Amino acid sequence: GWVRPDLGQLSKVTKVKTDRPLPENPYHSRARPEPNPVIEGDLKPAKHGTRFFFWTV
Amino acid sequence: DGPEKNYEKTLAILQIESEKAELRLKEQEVRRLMRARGDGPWYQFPTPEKEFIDHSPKATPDN
């Protein structure tokens, strides 16, 4: 009763059902290091201006 | 005008010049710490963009 698969059928991507648990850390990776904390606030003008030597503004 | 104006202006100037002096010393201390520790917003040096890593299944399993 065997039917030969047509052209293209063996190269299809099928879905397989299994009761094996899904691995969650397949790469055995560590914890990613924390990001540098962000700085909160709205911009205000620079205090006393550029503060460049004797320039006032 | 009276001495008041020159006096209290000189007080106003001295405050401005003094606050600036402390900010300038505080920026050197800040820049010394960010540069040596890389934990601040400055002196962040580039690392490869991870968005171009290929996450697709590969021709081989072990990847």
UniProtKB/Swiss-Prot annotation, chain A:
Accessory subunit of the mitochondrial membrane respiratory chain NADH dehydrogenase (Complex I), that is believed not to be involved in catalysis. Complex I functions in the transfer of electrons from NADH to the respiratory chain. The immediate electron acceptor for the enzyme is believed to be ubiquinone. It is found in: Mitochondrion inner membrane; Mitochondrion intermembrane space; Mitochondrion. This is NADH dehydrogenase [ubiquinone] 1 alpha subcomplex subunit 8. Contains four C-X9-C motifs that are predicted to form a helix-coil-helix structure, permitting the formation of intramolecular disulfide bonds. Complex I is composed of 45 different subunits. Belongs to the complex I NDUFA8 subunit family. It comes from the Eukaryota. The chain holds residues 116 to 172 of 172 of the full protein.
Curated annotation (Swiss-Prot), chain B:
It is found in: Mitochondrion inner membrane. Complex I is composed of 45 different subunits. Belongs to the complex I NDUFB5 subunit family. Accessory subunit of the mitochondrial membrane respiratory chain NADH dehydrogenase (Complex I), that is believed not to be involved in catalysis. Complex I functions in the transfer of electrons from NADH to the respiratory chain. The immediate electron acceptor for the enzyme is believed to be ubiquinone. The chain holds residues 127 to 189 of 189 of the full protein. The lineage of its organism: Eukaryota, Metazoa, Chordata, Craniata, Vertebrata. This is NADH dehydrogenase [ubiquinone] 1 beta subcomplex subunit 5, mitochondrial.
